[PDB]
Amino acid sequence: ELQEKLIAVNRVSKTVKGGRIFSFTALTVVGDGNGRVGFGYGKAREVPAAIQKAMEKARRNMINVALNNGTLQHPVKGVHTGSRVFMQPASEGTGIIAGGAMRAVLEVAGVHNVLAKAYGSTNPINVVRATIDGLENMNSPEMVAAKRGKSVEEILG
Amino acid sequence: VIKAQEYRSQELNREAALARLVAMIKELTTEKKARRPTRPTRASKERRLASKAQKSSVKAMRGKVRSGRE
Known part of the structure; x- marks a missing residue:
């Protein structure tokens, strides 16, 4: 809910x-x-x-976030105010490997499978803004095949 | 052992050797006073405890706050 x-x-x-x-x-x-x-x-x-x-x-x-299968679409960086965060899509078992103040935002955004990391400064506010930055500027195959007038089969291979 | 030859006549040399002997026994029989090693001042002890309490008063409200709500 x-x-x-x-x-x-x-x-x-x-x-x-x-x-x-x-x-x-x-x-x-x-x-x-x-x-x-x-x-x-x-x-x-x-x-x-x-x-x-x-x-x-x-x-x-x-x-909003355009996520696939409860996991990210592609490894994404999320730099914000000296707090860089590298998140990565994982497979159907790995759960959520995220640091502090990132586990919460990922669990609540709904990504069930993810591999994360928090470089730079690990201040909760910064890493939160950073992870949300990443989860926002993310690309989905639909959006990409729309940008490049192309079929989804053409974009994904 | 004293070799007093600083003067000429034996009366002067005898009194002089006796003077050197008296002086050197005086000097080798005076002992230095016993240095009493002091403790810190009570003002410093309370200054220490007050600094302790001040840094502790800061650290108390420092750090992670506890809560019971979600």
């Missing part, structure tokens, strides 16, 4: 003249598990409200 997996909570500060101001910044990846996926960063002064507010943006910021 709608997987809404939290990923991270961080206690940020503001340091106003009287003293510190502790907030909490959630991060939540939501999605159906069939191609619909989005992430909401979300921050507030109390963790319940922060998580809820993050879910709000995650919902209203969904995107």
Whole structure:
């Protein structure tokens, strides 16, 4: 229906003249598990409200993904803000080999079979934006055979 | 053993050798004072404990936050 997996909570500060101001910044990846996926960063002064507010943006910021058989279409890179992420399509058994803050987004986007890696900086927000970048700029044989006026048999061999 | 020949007449040399003997026995029988090794100041001990508490107070709110909701 709608997987809404939290990923991270961080206690940020503001340091106003009287003293510190502790907030909490959630991060939540939501999605159906069939191609619909989005992430909401979300921050507030109390963790319940922060998580809820993050879910709000995650919902209203969904995107589509043209994925095949619950796995990617081709090995794809996802560089974003010094956080490079190399994801790779796998076969029907391998499950989801993804790092932290990437397992969640992949499980919720619905890719069941994948081989991932998180180069560079492994900050949850960056790797999330990076993986979603990758899952967005991905190519599907339909789209490619549409770009190049060609049959799917012609594109795929 | 003293070889006092810095003066001319035996009275001067005898008094001089006795003076060197007195001086050298004085000097080889005075002992240095016993260095009492100090401990750190209580001000420094409390400064240490306060730095400890400050870095701990930071590290407390640092790091991963716990939660009970999903």
